Amino acid sequence: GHNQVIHQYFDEKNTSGVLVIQTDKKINLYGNALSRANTEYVPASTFKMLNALIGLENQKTDINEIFKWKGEKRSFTAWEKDMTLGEAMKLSAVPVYQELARRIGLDLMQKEVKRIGFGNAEIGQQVDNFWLVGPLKVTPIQEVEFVSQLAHTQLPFSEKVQANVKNMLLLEESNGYKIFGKTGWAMDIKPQVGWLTGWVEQPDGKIVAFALNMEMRSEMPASIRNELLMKSLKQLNII
Ligand SMILES: *[C@H](O)[C@H](CO)[C@H]1C[C@H](S[C@H]2CN[C@@H](C(=O)N(C)C)C2)C(C(=O)O)=N1
């Protein structure tokens, strides 16, 4: 696990990103801009994990509720359907999670976020966008421990709610290993910030949490987050 090779991957994908790895409370940093680890960025779709948790915990929804698309034009055609909270998570389908947020309401959301202690724990006044254009901001270090805690079922929520949310996050299950995570991409701010926060379940049950953060750019493909992360984790011999 050479901190040089990984620098060269971020070097050569022309970006500015850091990869945070936490393995039972030791945090290692990789990339080409390690200073990113301690600066706050808007969380974007990575805040859906926390949004589900709050919603499920407060019984504003459940994993079987179907969210009806009422016909407004949305940003992707894949989002123009009825779907479950879990389907909306796989697609990062913002409008669904804005509905949920509006159900929670400002007060509940503000109390929950500051109770969890997530990022700056500031959501301002508009309860269905604070995680896309501020004011809510979080460092990649805080994100990896948040997701580390979730993987270990150690967040301040009931266990069944955390398990419900973990099951929406399954990204890939190959050769004995399991990968969980949530992509993010804040497109409507400068600079654009892209995320991929989650964890690896090693076949023996060891948990390795991770939080990819990079500066984003409109012409980049979606998979540049997965390509960067996959070959970084294979390098570190986490897979
Ligand atoms: C906010 O919309 C943001 C969450 O950070 C979205 C934008 C990108 S792109 C997203 C659109 N739908 C997914 C997909 O591949 N399709 C077309 C179903 C991907 C994003 C992300 O994936 O990080 N989340």
Numbering used by the authors: 35 to 273
From the article:
Although selected strains of A. baumannii produce β-lactamases of all four Ambler classes, this pathogen is most recognized for its ability to produce carbapenem-hydrolyzing class D β-lactamases (CHDLs), which render the pathogen resistant to the last-line carbapenem antibiotics. Among them, the OXA-23-like carbapenemases are most widespread and have been detected in up to 83% of A. baumannii clinical isolates. In the class D enzymes, the acylation step requires activation of the catalytic serine by an adjacent lysine residue post-translationally modified by carboxylation; this same carboxylated lysine is also involved in activating a water molecule, which attacks the acyl bond during the deacylation step. Recent structural analyses have demonstrated that OXA carbapenemases have evolved the ability to hydrolyze carbapenem antibiotics by allowing ingress of the deacylating water to the active site.
The acylation of OXA-23 following addition of MA-1-206 was monitored at seven time points. Our time-dependent studies showed substantial density for the pyrroline ring, the sulfur atom, part of the pyrrolidine tail of MA-1-206, and the acyl bond with the catalytic serine (Ser79) from the earliest time point (t = 30 s) onwards. Much weaker density (only observable at low σ values) for the 6α-hydroxymethyl side group was seen for up to 2 min of observation, indicating that while a substantial amount of the acyl-enzyme OXA-23-MA-1-206 complex accumulates early in the reaction, the 6α-hydroxymethyl side group of MA-1-206 remains mobile for most molecules for at least the first 2 min. Refinement of the 30 s ≤ t ≤ 2 min complexes shows that at these early time points, the hydroxyl group adopts an orientation pointing away from Ser79 and Lys82CO2. At the earliest time point, there is a small density lobe in the residual Fo-Fc map, suggesting that some MA-1-206 molecules may still be present as the Δ2 tautomer. At the three shortest time points (30 s ≤ t ≤ 2 min), the average MA-1-206 occupancy was less than unity but was still well occupied (approximately 80%), as expected based upon the strength of the residual Fo-Fc density. In contrast, at the early time points (30 s ≤ t ≤ 2 min), occupancy of the O62 hydroxyl atom was much lower (35 to 55%); however, it increased to 100% at the longer time points. At time points 30 s ≤ t ≤ 2 min, both the Val128 and Leu166 side chains were in “closed” conformations, whereas at time points 3 min ≤ t ≤ 25 min, the Val128 side chain transitioned to the “open” conformation during refinement. Calculation of the molecular surface inside the active site of the t = 30 s complex shows that when these two residues are closed, there is a continuous surface over the carboxylated lysine.
